[PDB]
Amino acid sequence: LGAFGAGTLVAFIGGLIKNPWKPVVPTAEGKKAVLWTSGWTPRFKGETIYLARAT
């Protein structure tokens, strides 16, 4: 019962669990986790990120 319950709960939850520090966001210094980056992270070296106004 304990082993089956552990396996079944792990099966339920593992769908939810996502590694927050999986390197997914591409960056000039290699793929990085989301929280380490934003739209201001240079996707490539010398990238020109304009401070564009939101009309």
């Binding site: 591409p26 996707r43 490539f44 070296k45 010398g46 990238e47 020109t48």
Partner: protein, 54 residues
């Protein structure tokens, strides 16, 4: 508690230099080109202007 990093350090700073961006390796694999043509020479493309001076 206070966060580890703050304060000026009494350092004035310098005006940011004019930004000079580089080509896009991540987005562009190569170097994009403008006008196209046969251009059986060193290369001129499909765009070549001139200015008439007095």
């Amino acid at each position: 508690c206070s966060p580890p990093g703050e304060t000026a350090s009494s350092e004035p700073g310098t005006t940011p230099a004019i930004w000079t961006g580089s080509p896009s390796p991540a987005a562009p694999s190569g170097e994009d080109h403008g006008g196209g043509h046969g251009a059986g020479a060193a290369g001129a493309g499909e765009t070549l202007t001139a200015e008439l001076k007095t």
